[PDB]
Design a protein around this ligand. Structure first.
Ligand SMILES: CC(=O)N[C@@H]1[C@@H](O)[C@H](O[C@@H]2O[C@H](CO[C@]3(C(=O)O)C[C@H](O)[C@@H](NC(C)=O)[C@H]([C@H](O)[C@H](O)CO)O3)[C@H](O)[C@H](O)[C@H]2O)[C@@H](CO)O[C@H]1O
Ligand SMILES: CC(=O)N[C@@H]1[C@@H](O)[C@H](O[C@@H]2O[C@H](CO[C@]3(C(=O)O)C[C@H](O)[C@@H](NC(C)=O)[C@H]([C@H](O)[C@H](O)CO)O3)[C@H](O)[C@H](O)[C@H]2O)[C@@H](CO)O[C@H]1O
Ligand SMILES: CC(=O)N[C@@H]1[C@@H](O)[C@H](O[C@@H]2O[C@H](CO[C@]3(C(=O)O)C[C@H](O)[C@@H](NC(C)=O)[C@H]([C@H](O)[C@H](O)CO)O3)[C@H](O)[C@H](O)[C@H]2O)[C@@H](CO)O[C@H]1O
Ligand SMILES: *[C@@H]1O[C@H](CO)[C@@H](O)[C@H](O)[C@H]1NC(C)=O
Ligand SMILES: *[C@@H]1O[C@H](CO)[C@@H](O)[C@H](O)[C@H]1NC(C)=O
Ligand SMILES: *[C@@H]1O[C@H](CO)[C@@H](O)[C@H](O)[C@H]1NC(C)=O
Ligand SMILES: *[C@@H]1O[C@H](CO)[C@@H](O)[C@H](O)[C@H]1NC(C)=O
Ligand SMILES: *[C@@H]1O[C@H](CO)[C@@H](O)[C@H](O)[C@H]1NC(C)=O
Ligand SMILES: *[C@@H]1O[C@H](CO)[C@@H](O)[C@H](O)[C@H]1NC(C)=O
Lengths: 170, 323, 323, 170, 323, 170
């Protein structure tokens, strides 16, 4: 199996960012509630706030001119096109610019999540180079769930972990 | 030996949906939100409760003055907005010009409720003929005239000076329309009006207009070289309009009461009625949409999404979708 | 065993200040900079050294022509900008129209220095009466007239043809105003002017105007059915204005010299003078501000911040403030 | 005590980004001058440059129209509102967009600073998972100040550090 | 002991090129792309195949009517765009006004091909003199007149009523110009036209114009107090223009056929011809550029880059360049 | 020699991001084709897409007004200046904003590349703190080129690497 470094998981569904735990009592995916929700309240707010800054925007209205008011008929036309062209630019660019600020927001949220556990584990585990960690100790379906919600007692598993590390340099 | 593991990873799916970036196009993504409305019912609908004035083959001039080919519109009262065709065929049947026409249509785009009333009944013309009529303003084969204005001509063989007034005792503004006939020659003039050097003068608190016929040789339009130029104003409450003439007067019989103003518009569309309802209407069709943008036509009326000229506006929500 | 340590960390404080983001609102922050000015002194002030023309209850027409209720303004010379009320009460006391009024007010918005001068003294009218006067242009109970224009009427029992000129020998442009009286009937005409078929003609290098009275029955305004329509132009240096008339002329006595042009404006405000100074003035109050934006009123004059319709513009400077 | 991973320090004041040193001769906070100033010359320049791109902007001017110039009175009005609405959008959005480019600029400046020392120390110290480092050797108030200004002689403390590391796997 | 190594690093060079950022200015970079065009050939060139109309020292009025000082332009047919100087000296040699002038120049900015034709040959005037002439419209010392319009005056000692028509049998629109003379006094009038109370009346399907001379005393321009006011319209195919007059008529001899419409313009430039080609032209010079922007002059014609007022637009491409 | 932490390399030319390999058979710079090209197709697309969103933009046209049309002459003028001023703002700001999104794009592409190898090597090498790695094993001009194109067999060199590591704590 493999983490974020080589693609995404069709297996996880309860969220956008999450873990997979392979241990002795069982496998399975599990989303990180905190960061995922954080990416829902954010993207949503982004949407509504795009709509609302567009809630005020120019409104074209038709005006008739006669045969001897060609100069103002043409002024009127350049004016209403002008604003139409300005707001079409502002929308297409706002969307493009914030699309990019969105994909990067996902690409950073993942890496921050990887770093969240890499900081929690340190030498009690070995990072496999594929977005996965191999525990130097046994991690019951209770140490796994400890890591996920950020509640990981390091010294508790510290000893067992250390000994299994120098066995590998025995 | 193999030990326990945890991984960090992200969502995928069977999502064909793409979005765009300044730096990268057609990015396959898990979730996208389209924010552009690209479809209309193609119909001219009611606007909320209220129904539009489809002038069909008449123009605002024709309707208001009463081109005989526009009798349908003789007693309209309340509308939501006006649809007028691009080039309507029935405007001024008797060839001529409408003074400050556009400024009137613009004024109509702020009105949605008329009440036609009678200010000078034909009965008043007890010393003039009120049966002036033309083949250009002809109804069923037989020559007729504008339904709302009267071609005053000579009775027996005199045209005594006219001096008539109407007082706006109502508490609404009043739209009044008159006109004047330009004869082709002095012979044709006296055959119709007897008198030779003529004028039409209208007076209010604000208006102070003097009109004089212009005899001149013009090209034939609808067979005629004569011309009728028309005029308008707004008579404020408790104000009096005053007509004086000694020939060529086209007197108003009816005047339109402005009962309700309100945001409206005059749309230009070839379409007919559609017998449907909406809260957002464009010249080419109505909109039922929650979207924040649309791209069908800029000239909308009602609570609508914002017009942009885009073919596509779609926002990324989910993540890049790795197949 | 516990060893020495170093940490990496960041600033906090007791900072209630928030800012906003596309993705997140009300973000508590350590330091913020507000860039929107939301307060004005509510007063109409001097603009730099110079003091404004508050027309009070007169209108530009009233002031310029000299409505008797506007004598205060008889000798203004230099201003910074003009304040005129929305609906001033004293414009044209004698009912009538001011020709190309708006184009004049617009011209005044490019002038800040007048010098009223005398081009045709009443003394010149050695064969006409210059005491035409009306109850509509009435001062202290007794009927009067516009201070700057003269109601020429018949002397003894003749109105001899008028043919008078003024040469602009000064090196500034000159604003001249004349007018014409529309009588109610031919009786009233000859009672005032003797002559029956009349004209007023003004001529310069550019101007070539012929005016003719319009007898017509109009509604009563201020008790009157008569009307006086006024007109203007700019007489360039070393050019001559030429009036010819045989009745109904309202002659200019005074003409305004355009000594200094400059960026100015005509503001619309109900407010009075405020006896204060500023470099930035809006119709509802002045601004003393270093801010780059403001939101009080779009119609400003002077070196000002940029108007936006925002309630709030505040920039983040410090860091998210973790309590 | 604790680093950036769990909040910010009311104790530091001389700057935005900095350290706390806990050793044998004494504790105390100390800002990193270089990165902090770098975040002053930057945010300031951001401000002035927002003002200056707004230094050129539409100016509404009043125009009078009569009773028979309703069409151009209405054109004038839609035009002056139009530009007012366009510039109100440009400002509210410039502020929102650069607010975000500001908080992230802080959030990256910290992490870059953490990485600045983590690269300087490596195995001569153990990263505690909370934005702090525990030295494997003794760091006088002179080795601390060595780390801060980026002048850290690694081999000099290399030996002492190594020996104290395998004592922990003795 | 020293072992094998790999590093991660990035590009540098000897690159002086800088770019800008919101937060940081003058950032030395390895590669930059400038997207602003800041140079023009300073010349007025052909536009694609086609050559411009440089009116030089004439104005559109002068050219069209035929001010004698503008004979060069007597037979122009096809252009790309029109260059007219700011203040050309030869417009209306005989002092006067051109009615709806601007609306005509605006109409010309949609035309690029004229064909002058002859609708009323001088030969037609078998009972009037066609040699009216003035010192203001003077050519080589000797007094002349506009080449395209004829000063009809009295023959022997009568001016019989004129009643002449022209039918637009061609399948293009037709631009026709007439005029009217304002004499200084009744003596001068009859010396030229015999008749005393005069009119000029023009009629088409649409037009219905009556003109009347205005005798009035005006200032002297080019020594003269007389005035000639000119007028225009478009005669649609198979329509007839009709002139009637009994004095003061300035008859058209020639009428301009509108063979090709098309996007054009009237530029204002002091420059002369440049004998060169381009696809993008500004009033101060042409552009040969692949750039997406330019900053020379906003008033361009042809396929051009977009005008911005920037002094500098340069994009970063490479990386910060560490020396 | 030194990596990205202390400047850029005039020596590399075949690309924007790359490596230098110092081993037993020879030195020399070598760009990472994948990431460099990725930064060409990107920056280029950025350019064209700036042009194309400006491909639709207001066009000023001259209009003449007479002596008694000063109000609309002035309206026309404020209108054409207004749009000129709006589009000059949109361009100068688009350039400034995307210049910044460009330099950061480079500054992240490098760090992602460093992390690409740091993940590939792990304990088979020692990160020197200057953007360089020192192999604990021998890396022929074939193990180097293995690391670069992301094809690095870790267990193959695992053993030799481990033994040379505890010699350093012998
Ligand atoms: C009233 C009458 O008997 N009129 C006869 C003329 O009509 C006729 O000349 C021909 O007139 C044609 C147009 O005739 C009308 C029309 O517009 O249809 C007939 C109307 O009844 C008349 N109405 C009034 C109020 O006068 C109207 C009017 O005179 C004109 O519109 C004035 O411009 O004209 C058409 O123009 C033919 O080309 C024309 O020859 C003559 C011929 O004998 O006899 C008249 O008695
Ligand atoms: C000059 C004189 O004796 N006029 C008497 C009329 O005034 C009077 O008719 C009444 O006039 C009222 C208005 O009177 C004035 C005015 O505007 O106040 C009086 C002015 O002196 C006079 N000025 C001039 C230069 O003529 C002026 C002028 O005639 C009108 O403005 C012309 O429009 O009128 C008011 O209109 C009453 O409703 C009206 O009955 C009659 C009645 O006997 O006698 C006149 O001698
Ligand atoms: C036709 C003739 O003999 N005219 C003599 C007058 O010209 C002359 O009065 C002087 O006229 C000067 C202008 O003379 C012209 C002109 O504009 O150059 C001469 C033209 O031939 C004449 N053309 C026509 C068709 O009439 C023209 C025209 O009358 C005016 O433009 C009408 O406004 O005038 C100049 O104005 C001098 O200031 C003036 O004194 C008198 C003097 O004896 O004799 C006339 O016979
Ligand atoms: C992006 O996808 C659309 C829809 O299939 C396609 O028409 C377009 O060509 C694609 N983009 C490119 C650069 O080909
Ligand atoms: C209407 O005309 C009559 C005379 O025909 C007149 O007595 C009356 O005063 C006029 N109405 C008004 C309001 O002037
Ligand atoms: C943000 O703070 C303001 C000021 O107290 C408050 O009115 C507003 O409701 C807050 N935002 C939200 C989403 O509640
Ligand atoms: C002013 O009028 C007199 C006659 O009243 C006349 O002699 C003089 O030439 C006129 N002034 C000008 C500049 O024409
Ligand atoms: C940036 O470089 C230009 C060109 O040499 C120079 O004029 C300008 O002063 C520099 N910027 C600053 C802030 O000095
Ligand atoms: C042109 O005038 C003649 C009389 O001079 C007339 O017979 C003819 O009908 C007129 N042309 C047109 C098209 O009316």
């Amino acid at each position: 199996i493999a983490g974020f470094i080589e693609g995404g998981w069709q297996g996880m569904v309860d969220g956008w960012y999450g873990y997979h735990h392979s241990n002795e009592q069982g496998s399975g995916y599990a989303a990180d509630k905190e960061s995922t929700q954080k990416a829902i309240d954010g993207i949503t707010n982004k949407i509504n706030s795009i709509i609302d800054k567009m809630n005020t925007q120019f409104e074209a209205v038709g005006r008739e001119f006669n045969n001897l008011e060609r100069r103002i008929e043409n002024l009127n036309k350049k004016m209403e096109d002008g604003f139409l062209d300005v707001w079409t630019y502002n929308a297409e660019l706002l969307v493009l610019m914030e699309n990019e600020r969105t994909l990067d927001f996902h690409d950073s949220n993942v890496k921050n999540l990887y770093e969240k556990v890499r900081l929690q584990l340190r030498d009690n585990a070995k990072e496999l180079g594929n977005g996965c960690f191999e525990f130097y100790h046994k991690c019951d379906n209770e140490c796994m769930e400890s890591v996920k919600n950020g509640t990981y007692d390091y010294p508790q598993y510290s000893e067992e972990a250390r000994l299994n590390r120098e066995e590998i340099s025995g | 030996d193999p030990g326990d593991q945890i991984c960090v990873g992200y969502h995928a799916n069977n999502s064909t949906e793409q979005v765009d970036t300044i730096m990268e196009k057609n990015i396959t993504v898990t979730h996208a939100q389209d924010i552009l409305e690209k479809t209309h019912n193609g119909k001219l609908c009611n606007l909320n409760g209220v129904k539009p004035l489809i002038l069909k083959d008449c123009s605002v001039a024709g309707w208001l003055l009463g081109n005989p080919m526009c009798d349908e519109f003789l007693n309209v009262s309340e509308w939501s907005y006006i649809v007028e065709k691009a080039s309507p065929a029935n405007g001024l049947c008797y060839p001529g010009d409408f003074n400050d026409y556009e400024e009137l249509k613009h004024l109509l785009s702020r009105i949605n409720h008329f009440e036609k009333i009678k200010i000078i009944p034909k009965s008043y013309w007890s010393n003039h003929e009120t049966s002036g009529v033309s083949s250009a303003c002809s109804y069923l084969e037989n020559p007729s005239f504008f339904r709302n204005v009267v071609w005053l001509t000579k009775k027996d063989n005199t045209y005594p000076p006219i001096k008539v007034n109407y007082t706006n005792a109502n508490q609404k503004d009043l739209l009044v329309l008159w006109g004047i006939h330009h004869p082709n020659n002095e012979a044709e003039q006296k055959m119709i009006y007897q008198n030779l050097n003529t004028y039409v003068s209208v007076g209010t608190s604000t208006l102070n207009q003097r009109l004089v016929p212009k005899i001149a040789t013009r090209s034939k339009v609808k067979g005629l070289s004569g011309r009728m130029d028309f005029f308008w104003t707004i008579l404020k409450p408790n104000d009096t309009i005053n007509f004086d003439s000694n020939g060529n007067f086209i007197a108003p019989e009816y005047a339109y009461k402005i009962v309700k103003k309100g945001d409206s518009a005059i749309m230009k569309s070839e379409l007919e009625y559609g017998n449907c309802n909406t809260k957002c209407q464009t010249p080419i069709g109505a909109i039922n949409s929650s979207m924040p943008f649309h791209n069908i036509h800029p000239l909308t009326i009602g609570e609508c999404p914002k017009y942009v000229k885009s073919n596509r506006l779609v926002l990324a929500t989910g993540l890049r979708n790795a197949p």
